[PDB]
Every structure is written in structure tokens, then in C-alpha cells.
């Protein structure tokens, strides 16, 4: 469809087992689901230092949808990581970018079961802005108003203020979700949940001593 030629369906990737197990981080997957159901400031932007698992929270949200562990208002939603690169690519003509983004947003309103995920939401400023063309930020800023566009974002703490914050319009709509760096004890439980992925790729065995050592020595 229109969303597969731009976005990556994370919900379909979670059905096929292509997303890593996101153990822990549950209190913030369900917190993203709280923010998506709010009156205003209903767009959760996952802020956190690079590496703490901001993409993994939404990848853990996709795994929660396919397991039926979400509320019925977010049941069988399709998360799409809309990359701006596939949206700019092509577009060797006029409006090509605004109509490829209008067809994305029309497809979100038509099916109505899409939670858009914009990873690197700071990169929304200046996407497809061509000569005599409006970027992807100016196209959506409006849609956010109508609330016809619940998006999930994921920036760093630096690039949240450096951009998303400033926009005052976005402020009353985007809600910064703190994606904290986990503790060592939380990280060991992440590594235990990720044994079977890294023990199968390398066909090795990873002892419990190694994962406690991996999170402590790191």
C-alpha cells in the first residue's frame, strides 16, 4: 500500500518476529499508550540519550500490539516508522513531495488504525522543503492541530529542545516521554531477554556471568 512504500510496518515486523525482544521498558510502552489517549499533548515524543532504547520502546509497542497486550483502543493498530528518506526519494518533480505525504496522511485517516512513528522527529524540519516547496514539518504541523495525526516521535534530549521544543505550536501537542538510561540490573534483564537472539546469530552460549559482567563493566 501507500504506507509500505514509505514506512516500515513495525506491527508486521513484530508478527514475523523480526523485532528484538524489548523486555523491561514495559512501564514506558504503556506510558506511550497513556499519552496517545490524552486530550491534548497526545503525541508522545520519546526523548533520551542515544542508545537507551527509544526505538526499542516503539518496537516494544509493536510487539505489545501483536500479543494483544494493548488496550482495545490500540488493538490491532499498525505502527509505521515513516522514514523521511523514502519520502524525499523520488520527487524529481513538483508537489511530488507534498502529494506523497498527503497520500500518507490520507491513508492514515482512511484506515484509521495507523499509529505513525516518526523516528528522529527533529529531522522532520527540512524534509522535502525544495525550492518553492514546503518541508514535511510545515505539512504536518497543521495535521497535528486537527488531531488527525497521532504521531510518536523519538529524539535525543539535545535535539528535542534544539527543535521540537522551540516550536511553541508543537509544545502543546508533543509530550516528551523520558526514556531513561536503564540501570545495570535492568540491563542484565535486557541481556537475558536478548540471549536467544545473540546466541542464535553467533551460535554461541552466553552465560549469566557474562551478561552480569557485560552490564557492570559497561
Amino acid at each position: 500500500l501507500v504506507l509500505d512504500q514509505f514506512g516500515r510496518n513495525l506491527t508486521a515486523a513484530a508478527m514475523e518476529g523480526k523485532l528484538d525482544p524489548v523486555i523491561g521498558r514495559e512501564k514506558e510502552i504503556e506510558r506511550v499508550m497513556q499519552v496517545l489517549s490524552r486530550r491534548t499533548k497526545n503525541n508522545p515524543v520519546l526523548i533520551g540519550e542515544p542508545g537507551v532504547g527509544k526505538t526499542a520502546v516503539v518496537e516494544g509497542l509493536a510487539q505489545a500490539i501483536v500479543h494483544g497486550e494493548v488496550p482495545e483502543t490500540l488493538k490491532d493498530k499498525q505502527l509505521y516508522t515513516l522514514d523521511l528518506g523514502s519520502l524525499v526519494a523520488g520527487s524529481r518533480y513538483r508537489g511530488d513531495f507534498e502529494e506523497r505525504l498527503k497520500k500518507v496522511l490520507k491513508e492514515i485517516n482512511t484506515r484509521g488504525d495507523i499509529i505513525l512513528f516518526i523516528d528522529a522527529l527533529h529531522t522532520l524540519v527540512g524534509a522535502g522543503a525544495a525550492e518553492g516547496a514546503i518541508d514535511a514539518a510545515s505539512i504536518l504541523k497543521p495535521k497535528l492541530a486537527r488531531g488527525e495525526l497521532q504521531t510518536i516521535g523519538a529524539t535525543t534530549l539535545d535535539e528535542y529542545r534544539k527543535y521540537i521544543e522551540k516550536d511553541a505550536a508543537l509544545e502543546r501537542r508533543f509530550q516528551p516521554v523520558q526514556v531513561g538510561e536503564p540501570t545495570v540490573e535492568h540491563t542484565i534483564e535486557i541481556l537475558k531477554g536478548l540471549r536467544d537472539r545473540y546466541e542464535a546469530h553467533h551460535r554461541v552460549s552466553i552465560t549469566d556471568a557474562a551478561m552480569v559482567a557485560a552490564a557492570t563493566l559497561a
Binding site: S91, R92, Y93, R94, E131, G132, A133
Partner: peptide, 24 residues
């Protein structure tokens, strides 16, 4: 007794020329 007031030079440069994307 004396103090030298140094002088923290700031990095100040002219605005960047941009390269354009063409839409025919």
C-alpha cells in the same frame, strides 16, 4: 595586584550559502 582581562574571542562567521534542490 594586577589583573589581566584576557579577551574570549567568539567564533563568528558569515551565513552559509546553500545548495538548492531543483523542482522542474
Amino acid at each position: 595586584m594586577k589583573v589581566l582581562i584576557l579577551a574570549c574571542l567568539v567564533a563568528l562567521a558569515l551565513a552559509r550559502e546553500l545548495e538548492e534542490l531543483n523542482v522542474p
